[PDB]
Design a protein around this ligand. Sequence first.
Ligand SMILES: *[C@@]1(=O)[C]N([C][C]([C][C]([C])[C])[N]C(=O)O[C]C2=[C][C]=[C][C]=[C]2)[C][C]1[N]C(=O)[C]([C][C]([C])[C])[N]C(=O)O[C]C1=[C][C]=N[C]=[C]1
Length: 215
Amino acid sequence: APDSVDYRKKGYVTPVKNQGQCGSCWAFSSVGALEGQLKKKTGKLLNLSPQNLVDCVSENDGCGGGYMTNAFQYVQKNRGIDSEDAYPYVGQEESCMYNPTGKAAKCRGYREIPEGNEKALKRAVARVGPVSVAIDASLTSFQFYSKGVYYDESCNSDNLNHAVLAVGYGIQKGNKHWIIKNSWGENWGNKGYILMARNKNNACGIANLASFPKM
Ligand SMILES: *[C@@]1(=O)[C]N([C][C]([C][C]([C])[C])[N]C(=O)O[C]C2=[C][C]=[C][C]=[C]2)[C][C]1[N]C(=O)[C]([C][C]([C])[C])[N]C(=O)O[C]C1=[C][C]=N[C]=[C]1
């Protein structure tokens, strides 16, 4: 495994989105992971639909919150997820209106990464690619973050409240780090991204609830 990885360069990462006034971060996390497998699978970097997930994933709560695992599971038994086009995002949950002809990807199951192991996570990201993760994002530093390797001592590993997307890792001046994609706009953090501390004892709980779809 390399000492550096960034799937932004290789082309596994689409543009940053905004979830708006809805708790759909678990959707944008699931869609990111799915997108990344696509580019590897069928060379195409398409923008999937976080809204199809919001409305149809009955095991979740939609704008109230949910798990990525449920969202991947749904994409399997329902045999498919659309392109943003066939189900654009309106940040309002609504009655399920999935569309066969829309279909732009599918996944056959999901794998969960060993709870709390950042060594397994670095490997999953080096070998598989973009991985869905959860984190504690209540800290005010997180919202006002602007540059550098993020680390705050009040980040609770047991209070996962936001889902995000890990798309690589590397080291900035002696400080190892996870490269994270957020769904809060490009006007947040560093152009929609944040460098989170790595190896520093499960910072914020980044390796506690991580997964990826199988294609
Ligand atoms: C996110 O949007 C979706 N939700 C997911 C949460 C944990 C996941 C594992 C990450 N699950 C959950 O709450 O489970 C509910 C459930 C489970 C099973 C069945 C039924 C229901 C958490 C949620 N996160 C947020 O909404 C965050 C919270 C931060 C502040 C901690 N807020 C956010 O993104 O704010 C939106 C915003 C608006 C404007 N400008 C910037 C940001």
